[PDB]
RNA sequence: CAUAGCAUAUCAGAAGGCACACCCGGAGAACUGAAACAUCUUAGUACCCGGAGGAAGAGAAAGAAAAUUCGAUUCCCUUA
RNA sequence: GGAUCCUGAGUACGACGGAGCACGUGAAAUUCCGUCGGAAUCUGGGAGGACCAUCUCCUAAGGCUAAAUACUCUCUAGUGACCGAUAGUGAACAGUACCGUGAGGGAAAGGUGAAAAGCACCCCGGAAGGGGAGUGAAAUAGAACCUGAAACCGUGUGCUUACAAGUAGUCAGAGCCCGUUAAUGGGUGAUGGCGUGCCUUUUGUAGAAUGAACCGGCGAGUUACGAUUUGAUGCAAGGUUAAGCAGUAAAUGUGGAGCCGUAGCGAAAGCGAGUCUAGGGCGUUUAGUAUUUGGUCGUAGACCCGAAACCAGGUGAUCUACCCUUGGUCAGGUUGAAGUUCAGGCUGAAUGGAGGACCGAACCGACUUACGUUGAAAAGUGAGCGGAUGAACUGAGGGUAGCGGAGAAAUUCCAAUCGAACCUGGAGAUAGCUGGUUCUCUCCGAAAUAGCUUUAGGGCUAGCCUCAAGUGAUGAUUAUUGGAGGUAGAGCACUGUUUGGACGAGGGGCCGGUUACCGAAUUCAGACAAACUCCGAAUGCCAAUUAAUUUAACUUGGGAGUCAGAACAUGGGUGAUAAGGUCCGUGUUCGAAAGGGAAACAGCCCAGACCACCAGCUAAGGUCCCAAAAUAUAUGUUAAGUGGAUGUGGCGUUGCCCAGACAACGUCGAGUGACACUGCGCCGAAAAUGUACCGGGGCUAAACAUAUUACCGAAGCUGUGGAUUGUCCUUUGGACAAUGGUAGGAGAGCGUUCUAAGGGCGUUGAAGCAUGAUCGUAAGGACAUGUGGAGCGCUUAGAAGUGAGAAUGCCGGUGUGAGUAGCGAAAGACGGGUGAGAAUCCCGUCCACCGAUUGACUAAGGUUUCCAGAGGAAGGCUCGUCCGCU
RNA sequence: AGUGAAUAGGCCCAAGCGACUGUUUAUCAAAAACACAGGUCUCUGCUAAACCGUAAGGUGAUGUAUAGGGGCUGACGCCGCCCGGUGCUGGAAGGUUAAGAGGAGUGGUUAGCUUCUGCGAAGCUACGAAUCGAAGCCCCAGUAAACGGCGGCCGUAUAACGGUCCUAAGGUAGCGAAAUUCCUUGUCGGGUAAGUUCCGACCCGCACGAAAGGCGUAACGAUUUGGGCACUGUCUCAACGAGAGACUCGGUGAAAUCAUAGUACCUGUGAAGAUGCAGGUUACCCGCGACAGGACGGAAAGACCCCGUGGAGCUUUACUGUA
RNA sequence: GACUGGGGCGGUCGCCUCCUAAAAGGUAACGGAGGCGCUCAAAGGUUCCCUCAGAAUGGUUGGAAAUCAUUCAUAGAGUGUAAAGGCAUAAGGGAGCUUGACUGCGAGACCUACAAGUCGAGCAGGGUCGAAAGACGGACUUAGUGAUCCGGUGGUUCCGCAUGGAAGGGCCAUCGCUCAACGGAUAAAAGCUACCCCGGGGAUAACAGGCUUAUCUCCCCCAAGAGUUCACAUCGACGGGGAGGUUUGGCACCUCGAUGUCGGCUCAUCGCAUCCUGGGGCUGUAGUCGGUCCCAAGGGUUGGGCUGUUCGCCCAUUAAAGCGGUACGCGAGCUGGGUUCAGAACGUCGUGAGACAGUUCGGUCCCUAUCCGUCGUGGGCGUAGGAAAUUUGAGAGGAGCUGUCCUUAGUACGAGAGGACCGGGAUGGACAUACCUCUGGUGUACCAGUUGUCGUGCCAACGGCAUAGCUGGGUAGCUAUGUG
RNA sequence: GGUGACAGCAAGGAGGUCACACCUGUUCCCAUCCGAACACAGAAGUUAAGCUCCUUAGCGUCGAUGGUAUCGAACUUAGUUCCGCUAGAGUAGAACGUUGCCAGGC
């Protein structure tokens, strides 16, 4: 009988943290999924063209603090 | 004229029935499957017609092939 | 010898249209039919999957041709881990009885005994039937004849019953009567407690949702060939034969065509423990193969039953429609439209009497209304009513046939069937839909959800279940530690909403201006947000660990089911701050869960049933009687039984103060009167069978409260004995245990029929049938006795038409309704006769009925029914001595 | 009491629809439906057209336009504006452009006569001015008892005329609240009755315009619809008689149905409407006669509604074929 | 075609962003909001530099402001495209040179049923910008497509039929139309059933039951005033507020192997939210009139004309002509007018088959009562001796309604006309009950009489049949309209 | 002065060619309407400003203690109890940088 104008939405992307602080990761592992730079790269960490943070060596991840509010993620080598 | 044909005297050659099971011909569906349906499938099946034999049909290289060859046709097992 | 003539004509070949070849017409190469066109004669011509060449290969346009091969309506001889009378052929005695116009469809029905010795004779009886007696091993072996179950119907008897409320049982329990597989014995049962059948389908069924009257028989995952994965066994770098052959329709023997493996990779040439494009994929660091067993799958009808329909070949116009040829019927009345004589000046004295005429019988029809509706009748009867010389009614013959025919037209008719008749076949059509699907126990045990889908009550993969093999901390819960993150709450600093309160430059007041006033701006002043935040939890999430208790977790395989969910409490959307509403999220319980409480009451509270007991402690809820346990204590409230008002309850301050404050127009003496946060009340509150919520009786506590204690209360836990299975010290026992269950997965068994081998039994009595107070954890097994009169167990192995309570299942038998509905229109009375028997048969004498017919003929059609004598088993809606019956 | 019994038309006034006699759904419809005698329109020159057949052969018809086949319409009597498939026979003549012939002239190649370069003839080759002329170009210069419509707006409830868009006009008479109008029992009204649904009186034409005929009739009629007079148990309001059933006795003797039954009520509970559950209340056992409240009574696997990649029939400018 | 708080009509169907979403991720509805089916040879790369809308300040025309300088001026600027998350390392605004908007690959990871999708260090090769480190595999991030099959263009060191070219396959690169219902039935496809059939479903609608109560009927709570004026005698304006009972709707829990029907007829039984009668009171009741309330449930509560009607308007009455429940009480008790059936006429709308919901005429209502229940009537047994007759009454059921004439009284009262209440017996009535037949009447099927046709015994008189042939009277019994 | 580890904004006060700035420039490499920017060449005079030394907490930044709730559990169907973890406001209070490795000069 009636006409509903709404009814749209998109598929949810699975953004956010992917590995845990203190956890041993492997080289080229994805540590955080994000639109934008909610968290910056750090030591032995890169960013891809989707704003994806990733490791560059085999180590241990620590989330830390960059300036006064900016946050970053690093990987430190020796396990 | 002559054919056709009329008869006559002759041989009875046929006609009907069917084991339609098998075999050889003429004609020839649909439901169904494709998760609908039309090319396709069921299927050259069912059913109808003929011939009708004890078997029918095929068969003796204008080939198969590529070797050094087999060697008409028909049937079984492989290749599959 | 090898080319001097011959060497298979509308042929070969081409095109347009089709077809057959595994092949959808492309390269159709190869081969055929229709229409047309249409070459060559051996250094020729045709083929080798388009095609051009070298190479092979062959010589069409003529004919015949054994063997090895297919099938069985038949014949003779035989065979079977094939059926035994609802089976096996439809058919053991039938294409019959019967049904249909026809094509066509199509049953039920075996049994005396060894031998008829098949019951001489007497008694009762009209007879039938029986009682003796006889024959027989045996007549409860007598033809309704082997055995003889159950439903259902009776006669007798031990116990019990006329104040009683019900799924008919179970547990307790007197009284009376008995005496067995003699054992913690059997029958019946005053009286008390508890208790809403089964199956199916469902979120949920006592259900007023489905199915079944009862009892008996029959009635549903099979086989063949392939594939995958388990178990077993042989051989092993190998393993194994197929068809065929000699043998018995067996084993065995033989027979290496083939198939798998020992090596893979790449599209492929190819390379090779490597290869394809260093870094990568699939590989190498070896066990396979044959037969057989279990599970699942594929092609077959593939677990069983069930459509509406489609197609093919046939049957029917003896019903009905229209037509053709040849024949019949239509009582009586009424009426003067060109009839017609005379008389008059064209109507009077007169009067053929026609017509889809107009009243009415025969005949044809069917408008109203009553009756009838398990009918007298699958379309009728009574009373009225329409036509009744016409387009009338009707007989005998012939003709049109299903995409058809016929139709004064209604989808109306075509054999009681028609928007497409009937029969047989394809055919076991298809049915993602409903129903049904048959012995026992032990262990484990879901789901009602993603995603996609011409998909939405279906399916597929994932999730969750089960079984086996492997791997080894990788599993779970708490501590102590880091970490990612914007919800509750709060807050306005940003985006928007906000109400009051604010300041002058200026368009403006004017006669350019004043100034208040209109608008925006900034301004001090303060509430709000799912799509505002910077200031942020509790929890939940990931992880790491020399941080403690626990027993999981994962990978690869075989097998599934599930895809309708429900209430409750908490977080939210939608709706109305509705719904036993609807949609998500986090838990619980039902589903699939018995037990106790809530009166009753899947989903609420407590709690998870292996089995025995007339042992004990407790949970939730309870302790006056029903109905177990406190009429228990001590101490308080309640008087009501089940919007505001002076209603009352404190802590309070207080204005006026006994100098005399509120009244009576100075008497008067003890507080006055106010203003509130809180306790019980107050009205507040007005439906239909019958008191009606303590469930009832009843209660002033037996109400509601608080604080102690006592006790009762479950299938929870503990005692005692037992079973089956894990678990592991393994003394397999002492323990550590465990043991509700639907779809469904796994294991172990019980019975039935048949076969092999070995041992048994049986006329001194097999199987079957009936009874018993016996044994086994269950399905089930014995033994004793009676009946029966020739076959049947056990042990180990093998093979299946291997188990029924449900399908509005199929067939047979027998109930209930019930001594009930009905006995089909219609005159009978009396006397006599015959008879075992008479309302009913025969004979009277009366009396009634039809009275254009219930009369007499004549047809079609039917086929002996017709006459006489005998007879009453069945038939005849009662009877029967009678009869269309024998 | 004289048709002394039995038999034998009820009438009158007003309206629809159909001319009439006839025919029709065997078995819920007998009629306004179908026919009909007449009208019309069209096709057929005869081995006619048309129809059945694969065809041969047939019917039409042993007929021949005063004859035959098909459609519409229905006796009798009174009764135009229009052809629009982006437009259809006439008057016409200026025309334009398809196919074809017409050739003043005009070029690569040597391009003579002139090598001191130009009417360039003429060959193979490579182009081109005149003026003329088909259907269509035209309002395609017919058509309606053929499919059809009869316009929108606006002055205003092409309604009356009044200015209009564009076309073929978008209305002849006649009728005019309409088996058709919701507003609208239109407003007007009236005849009849005590009280309405008892009969036609303006145009104020949603849903109007003439053989898919518009108006009038005398006859009809088991047709529809009103109003009177007879007359009556139709009713007030029932009573009494006569028979057949019923009901008692002798005889004979079914059927649908059925899980087993020792089968009460009220309030409640519950798959939300209980003989069977809870709490109460009432009730000795067993028949016959009568009634119809409940056993969600019996009967027919709901015909309404939805669903199935189920079907059948019909239509069409659905898709694909084909006579 | 599907979805769908039944279906149809309507809307939608793929992808992106945000809320709902409960601080990881995920998460529904026909819940609430917006975008996409591209664009850019620079808006790409790399080396440099460089940094506010607005306000205030003034300034040659000043559309006030664009153009002009100074004070700021938190980024509020701005970023091609909606949103969110991020950016002054600018990822924003200029300049140079350029094309990395390259060729092979990739340890490992995110996401996920699958097929798809996402990110990547770094290793080769060959390069652009920068002096150099170094940076670069498009774009601040995330939308801008869609398998396979067939078909079409070019390379090749692949196969290719005996051998060899070779058309054709294979591989590598590159295209095009359609799949928007966007996991695409093969890339070709409309309607009416009212003759409708079969398989199913209370998984899902229409009636009745159940829940709810927006709506509906009512009961309470608070006020400017009208009313001459006096708020409250009368009404309550804008009004908003609490409740109670469930009648048009919301929901889809029983019933689709059937719970089968609207009005009327016959017969009831409950309620009170009272129509009459019965009590009372208030009055802005002079007085009858009346207004107005409260208490009160026993009994009563009508005859017709029109419409199928519920409902509704009208004529006459009456003391009065209430409002509700009971499957909108009652169809195994009745009818069948309305409406859901096959025929037909008209109107409108469709090409048409048909439809509408408009009309109009015509159209088949089954059942033998088992159990419980109800109304009547019997058999059995019982109860401390057996019988016959009289009784008591625990407890049940039935009956309680109405109107005239007479005082009173013409007194109260009425400046006028108009008219109080109140007391006695009685009275004879209307309905409905329950007796009965003496009276008026009905009927009388074995009673008396008159009469017409016919047939028998032959005149007549009888008897038979014509509805008891017909006509006129009528005993007992049974009766109303009669009497109590 | 340079680089390098975890507090600001401004407001009065002063102090010097050792720092570095203020200036002199168009003269050159640089370089744009403008040597206003950017370059380079001066180095005359100089703490007036930037720099630089407490500093004022006035603005700003941190941040207590009290304790005003939401997991768990019962009671109940209207929010009440026992727990554990405790916010945002807001008070007090601090606070005008601790200061890592070199030159020069101490």
mmCIF file of C-alpha atoms (C1' of nucleotides) in Angstrom, chain C residues 321 406-413, chain D residues 23-26 29-31 33-35, chain E residues 342-345:
data_model
loop_
_atom_site.group_PDB
_atom_site.id
_atom_site.type_symbol
_atom_site.label_atom_id
_atom_site.label_comp_id
_atom_site.label_asym_id
_atom_site.label_seq_id
_atom_site.Cartn_x
_atom_site.Cartn_y
_atom_site.Cartn_z
ATOM 1 C "C1'" A C 321 -30.334 -33.122 -31.311
ATOM 2 C "C1'" A C 406 -25.973 -31.107 -33.804
ATOM 3 C "C1'" G C 407 -27.948 -26.519 -32.034
ATOM 4 C "C1'" A C 408 -35.447 -21.154 -33.321
ATOM 5 C "C1'" A C 409 -28.284 -20.198 -29.173
ATOM 6 C "C1'" A C 410 -28.738 -22.332 -23.093
ATOM 7 C "C1'" U C 411 -21.393 -24.286 -22.982
ATOM 8 C "C1'" U C 412 -27.329 -26.766 -24.338
ATOM 9 C "C1'" C C 413 -27.098 -32.254 -26.007
ATOM 10 C "C1'" U D 23 -38.514 -21.903 -29.294
ATOM 11 C "C1'" U D 24 -35.034 -22.381 -24.901
ATOM 12 C "C1'" U D 25 -30.823 -24.051 -20.216
ATOM 13 C "C1'" A D 26 -33.406 -33.295 -19.892
ATOM 14 C "C1'" A D 29 -33.794 -19.762 -14.618
ATOM 15 C "C1'" A D 30 -39.851 -20.152 -19.700
ATOM 16 C "C1'" A D 31 -38.530 -14.834 -19.574
ATOM 17 C "C1'" A D 33 -33.690 -13.984 -23.646
ATOM 18 C "C1'" C D 34 -33.927 -17.053 -29.181
ATOM 19 C "C1'" A D 35 -37.107 -16.877 -33.604
ATOM 20 C "C1'" A E 342 -25.350 -20.929 -13.641
ATOM 21 C "C1'" G E 343 -30.136 -16.811 -17.784
ATOM 22 C "C1'" A E 344 -31.203 -11.718 -19.347
ATOM 23 C "C1'" A E 345 -31.881 -6.050 -20.061
#
